[PDB]
Design a protein around this ligand. Sequence first.
Ligand code: NAG
Ligand code: NAG
Ligand code: NAG
Lengths: 24, 48, 32
Amino acid sequence: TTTQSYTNSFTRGVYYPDKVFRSS
Amino acid sequence: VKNKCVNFNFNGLTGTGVLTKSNKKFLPFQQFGRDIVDTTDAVRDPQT
Amino acid sequence: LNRADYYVGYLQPRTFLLKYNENGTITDAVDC
Ligand SMILES: *[C@@H]1O[C@H](CO)[C@@H](O)[C@H](O)[C@H]1NC(C)=O
Ligand SMILES: *[C@@H]1O[C@H](CO)[C@@H](O)[C@H](O)[C@H]1NC(C)=O
Ligand SMILES: *[C@@H]1O[C@H](CO)[C@@H](O)[C@H](O)[C@H]1NC(C)=O
């Protein structure tokens, strides 16, 4: 079986939107 | 021709300028490339 | 098979501001 507890994600789940190098 | 101003047609992307060695930490997925004003500044030669 | 996970979230259309580091890497991001 399984459970369905809840959990805060905080600052998480950010990916590079595209493939362009960026600095500063 | 890494040091002489040249008209380039890199993968359809036409333009004019010079090409010199670069240490840009282009992680292995970064391609066209750009700058702060988002203007193509560093193209990783696709062949090399 | 043979012989504490499953963390799922749903993304949404949002505007983000992302802080890039000198080596092309994402150090911090803030949800506007
Ligand atoms: C094409 O480029 C890749 C990456 O530089 C290289 O490993 C490969 O040998 C090249 N293929 C030919 C046929 O030149
Ligand atoms: C399943 O059991 C076989 C037999 O001992 C073993 O070789 C294999 O690595 C096992 N697979 C896993 C996922 O543990
Ligand atoms: C960028 O990468 C270089 C090489 O790994 C490293 O020496 C340097 O500390 C990095 N800079 C930052 C700000 O993390």
